[PDB]
Amino acid sequence: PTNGVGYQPYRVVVLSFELLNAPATVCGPKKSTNLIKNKCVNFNFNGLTGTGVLTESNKKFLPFQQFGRDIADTTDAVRDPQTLEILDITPCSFGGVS
Amino acid sequence: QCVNLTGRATIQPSFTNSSHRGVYYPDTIFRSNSLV
Numbered sequence: 529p530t531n532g533v534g535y536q537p538y539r540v541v542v543l544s545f546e547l548l549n550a551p552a553t554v555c556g557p558k559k560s561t562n563l564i565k566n567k568c569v570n571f572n573f574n575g576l577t578g579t580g581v582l583t584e585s586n587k588k589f590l591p592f593q594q595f596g597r598d599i600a601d602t603t604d605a606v607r608d609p610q611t612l613e614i615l616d617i618t619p620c621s622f623g624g625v626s
Numbered sequence: 627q628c629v630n631l632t633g634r635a636t637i638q639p640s641f642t643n644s645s646h647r648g649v650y651y652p653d654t655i656f657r658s659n660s661l662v
């Protein structure tokens with residue numbers, strides 16, 4: 529007990545965590561709000577944040593898939609883990625206005 | 627209880643080709659409609 533602080537024991541927990549397209553297992557304390565399905569909002573489904581419009585989607589996901597992907601590295605669809613529905617994600621910005 | 631096998635046949639290997647087999651997923655990253 530009475531040794532130098534360099535010789536005293538330290539407990540180390542090396543929390544190695546990976547986030548994949550699998551269903552989320554551990555989540556933070558963030559409180560789940562309601563769902564807005566026609567307005568440009570800031571969304572955060574399972575830690576995957578973004579800014580867009582969520583809409584009802586008819587795409588089919590794998591039973592363990594949480595989000596889809598576009599040709600670019602942008603998630604165009606996300607499975608809402610409460611209702612288990614699939615919501616299409618659309619950009620808030622509309623390009624083409626002159 | 628283990629028994630040293632009797633009536634063995636001096637095991638020797640044949641050899642062939644693996645063809646286009648054994649492909650697996652190099653990484654856990656999700657990819658869709660990609661070419662990497």
Ligand SMILES: *[C@@H]1O[C@H](CO)[C@@H](O)[C@H](O)[C@H]1NC(C)=O
Binds near residue numbers: 609610611612
């Ligand atoms: C999640 O909890 C809410 C509120 O209790 C409930 O209405 C909903 O059906 C639940 N969904 C799942 C998948 O458990």
Ligand SMILES: *[C@@H]1O[C@H](CO)[C@@H](O)[C@H](O)[C@H]1NC(C)=O
Binds near residue numbers: 628629630
């Ligand atoms: C099998 O043979 C080896 C080689 O001598 C010997 O060491 C081993 O004990 C044998 N196994 C049994 C179960 O007798």
Ligand SMILES: *[C@@H]1O[C@H](CO)[C@@H](O)[C@H](O)[C@H]1NC(C)=O
Binds near residue numbers: 642643
């Ligand atoms: C396997 O590869 C050898 C060359 O090493 C070739 O002679 C043989 O025809 C191949 N077998 C088949 C089934 O293609």
